[PDB]
C-alpha cells in the first residue's frame, strides 16, 4: 500500500483493511529496522556459500525445497559473485560468524512479538477431548 | 569432380550426457558415446 491462507487443507480469505497511513509506517519502520540490524561482517562468509548451497540443493532432497521458496538465494546464486573476504582485523582472537548468528536470534525472537502479538496461553486438556471445534470450551494454562 | 575430392574416411566418437528429461546430480557421470564413419559407405549383401 505505502508503495488467502491455507491451514489443515482449508482456505480462508482476509478482510483486513487500512483506514489510514500512520500505523502502516509505524510497522514498516520496525520491519526495516529489524531487517537492518541483522547484517554484520560475518554475513559475507555466509554469502559465499550460495553457489555451494545450489549444488547441495541438487545433491539432496530437503534443500531442494528450501531453495525454491528463497526468492533471492535462488536468483543470486547464479547471477552475482563475490571475491574472497579480507583478512579479519585481529582475526587471531575473535570469531565473526558467532557474532552474526548470536545477534541474529535476538532480532528473530522479537519479530513476531513486535509485528504481531505474543502467546499468552496454551491448550492443555488433561482428560477432555483431544481437538477442539469452533465454539467448544478448552482447558488452558497461562504462559 | 577433381575439384571436390575425398581424402580419407575417418572415425568419430561423439560423447554426451543425457538430456534434461533424464538428469540428476548423479546420472551426469553416465555419458553416452556414439560413432559415425565420415565419408564411409554402407553395402548390400556382400558379393565376396
| Residue B26: closest C-alpha in chain A | A59
Give me the resolution in angstroms, 1 decimal: 4.4
Beta bridge partner(s), residue B33: B15
Question: Do A114 and A34 meet the contact criterion of CB atoms below 8 Å apart?
Answer: yes
Residue A55 distance to chain B (closest CA, Å): 8
Interface check A58 vs B, CB under 8 A: yes
> Residue A123 has what DSSP assignment?
E
Give the closest residue to B16 by CA, choosing from B26, B30, B6. Answer: B30
Nearest residue of B to residue A59 by CA position?
A: B25
Residue A131: φ, ψ to 5°: -90, 175
Per the CB < 8 A criterion, the answer to whether A38 and A18 are in contact is no
State which residue of chain B sits closest to A54, comparing Cα positions.
Answer: B25
Which residues on chain B are in Cβ contact (under 8 Å) with A58? Answer: 24-25
Q: Which of residues 1-48 of B touch A (CB under 8 A)?
A: 24-25
- Chain B residues closer than 8 Å to A59 by CB: 25
Chain B residues lying within 8 Å of A67, measured CB to CB: none
What are the grid coordinates assigned to A141, written together?
494454562
Question: Are A107 and A39 contacting, i.e. CB atoms less than 8 angstroms apart?
Answer: no
C-alpha cell, A4 = 488467502
Greatest C-alpha distance within chain A = 62
Shortest distance between the Cα of B19 and any Cα of chain A, in A, equals 16
Chain A residue whose CA is closest to B24: A58
Contact A50, A78 (CB under 8 A): no
* A132, A123 contact by CB (below 8 A): yes
| Structure determined by | cryo-EM
String of DSSP letters for A14-42: ------SSHHHHHHHHHHHHHHHSS--TT
Cell digits of residue A116 = 504481531
Q: A25: which residues sit within 8 A by CB, 6+ positions away?
A: A2
Amino acid at each position: 500500500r505505502t508503495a488467502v491462507i491455507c491451514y489443515n487443507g482449508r482456505r480462508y480469505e482476509l478482510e483486513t483493511n487500512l483506514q489510514h497511513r500512520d500505523g502502516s509506517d509505524a510497522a514498516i519502520r520496525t520491519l526495516v529496522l529489524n531487517l537492518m540490524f541483522s547484517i554484520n561482517e560475518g554475513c559475507l562468509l555466509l554469502l559465499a556459500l550460495i553457489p555451494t548451497l545450489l549444488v547441495q540443493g541438487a545433491h539432496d532432497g530437503y534443500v531442494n525445497l528450501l531453495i525454491q521458496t528463497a526468492n533471492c538465494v535462488r536468483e543470486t546464486g547464479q547471477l552475482i559473485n563475490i571475491p574472497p573476504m579480507p583478512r579479519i582485523q585481529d582475526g587471531h582472537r575473535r570469531f565473526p560468524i558467532y557474532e552474526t548468528i548470536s545477534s541474529w536470534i535476538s532480532t528473530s525472537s522479537r519479530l513476531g512479538d513486535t509485528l504481531g502479538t505474543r502467546a499468552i496461553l496454551r491448550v492443555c486438556v488433561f482428560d477432555g477431548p483431544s481437538t477442539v471445534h469452533p465454539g467448544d470450551r478448552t482447558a488452558v494454562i497461562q504462559v | 569432380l577433381m575439384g571436390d575430392m575425398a581424402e580419407r574416411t575417418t572415425a568419430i566418437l561423439v560423447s554426451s550426457a543425457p538430456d534434461a528429461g533424464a538428469a540428476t546430480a548423479t546420472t551426469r557421470n553416465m555419458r553416452i558415446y556414439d560413432g559415425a564413419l565420415y565419408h564411409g559407405l554402407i553395402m548390400m549383401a556382400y558379393q565376396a
